[PDB]
Amino acid sequence: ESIRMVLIGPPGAGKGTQAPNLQERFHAAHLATGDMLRSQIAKGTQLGLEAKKIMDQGGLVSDDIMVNMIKDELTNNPACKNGFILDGFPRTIPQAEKLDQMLKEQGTPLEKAIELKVDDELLVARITGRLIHPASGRSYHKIFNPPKEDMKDDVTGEALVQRSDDNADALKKRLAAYHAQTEPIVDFYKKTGIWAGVDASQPPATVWADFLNKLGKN
Numbered sequence: 001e002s003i004r005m006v007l008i009g010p011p012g013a014g015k016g017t018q019a020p021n022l023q024e025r026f027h028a029a030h031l032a033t034g035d036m037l038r039s040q041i042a043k044g045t046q047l048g049l050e051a052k053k054i055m056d057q058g059g060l061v062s063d064d065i066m067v068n069m070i071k072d073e074l075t076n077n078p079a080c081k082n083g084f085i086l087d088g089f090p091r092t093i094p095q096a097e098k099l100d101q102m103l104k105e106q107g108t109p110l111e112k113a114i115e116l117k118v119d120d121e122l123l124v125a126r127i128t129g130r131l132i133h134p135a136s137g138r139s140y141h142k143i144f145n146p147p148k149e150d151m152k153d154d155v156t157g158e159a160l161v162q163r164s165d166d167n168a169d170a171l172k173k174r175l176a177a178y179h180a181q182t183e184p185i186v187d188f189y190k191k192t193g194i195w196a197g198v199d200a201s202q203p204p205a206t207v208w209a210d211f212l213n214k215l216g217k218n
């Protein structure tokens, strides 16, 4: 029950929705670079204030920053000994190449790169209806996956918010960047044989079952 894997998917595909499933199953560190950035933002740090502007425009934060963030976490974070789930990294070919390098040196290569495949049309409704609990990252959807207490993080009472980069202006820039910059990474992993595609247009439980199936564990 150990995994070192990457999650690749467009904005809205369902990475943050499935990761908890993977965490519980494999007890791996969930390293979501979007969550790390948002953490910077909330501490009011300088890196956070600069990342915030770019994120809100549907831009990508620079590779150097993102590689250093991940290198430190792989290195100093003890929870990353059991294995890890990279969520949102790598996001560009250079990050992919540098990650490859890093893991060679550490002698812990990636086992799986799961692509969550889902058409762009669907992704707009998903991003438009999303509410997150900002003090965790718990995502809900107004239509597709409602809080019972509306606008309230059901299990823990706290208030739900919209993400600032979930504006359909940012969203268009987010998708174009995914196709232009991130999608090429999929071929990289196809060529090393650790890629598996998952149908992320299905509902959550059906996607997770497909996941297990694809990991070759369940």
Ligand SMILES: Nc1ncnc2c1ncn2[C@@H]1O[C@H](COP(=O)(O)OP(=O)(O)OP(=O)(O)OP(=O)(O)OP(=O)(O)OC[C@H]2O[C@@H](n3cnc4c(N)ncnc43)[C@H](O)[C@@H]2O)[C@@H](O)[C@H]1O
Pocket: 009, 010, 011, 012, 013, 014, 015, 016, 017, 018, 032, 033, 034, 035, 037, 054, 055, 056, 058, 059, 060, 061, 062, 066, 087, 088, 089, 090, 091, 092, 095, 126, 127, 129, 130, 131, 139, 140, 141, 142, 144, 145, 165, 174, 200, 201, 202, 203, 204, 207
């Ligand atoms: N490495 C890096 N390099 C450079 N810049 C970087 C970077 N990492 C981060 N950044 C930057 O930070 C920004 C944000 O990154 P990040 O936060 O990683 O966002 P993202 O990749 O754009 O992804 P999302 O979080 O929007 O999607 P998701 O697939 O996790 O969705 P969710 O599960 O919530 O689900 C979406 C919604 O749909 C719902 N839903 C989920 N699954 C289903 C289902 N199967 N059916 C129906 N409803 C569903 C949910 O309930 C929810 O409402 C980047 O754009 C860039 O600026």
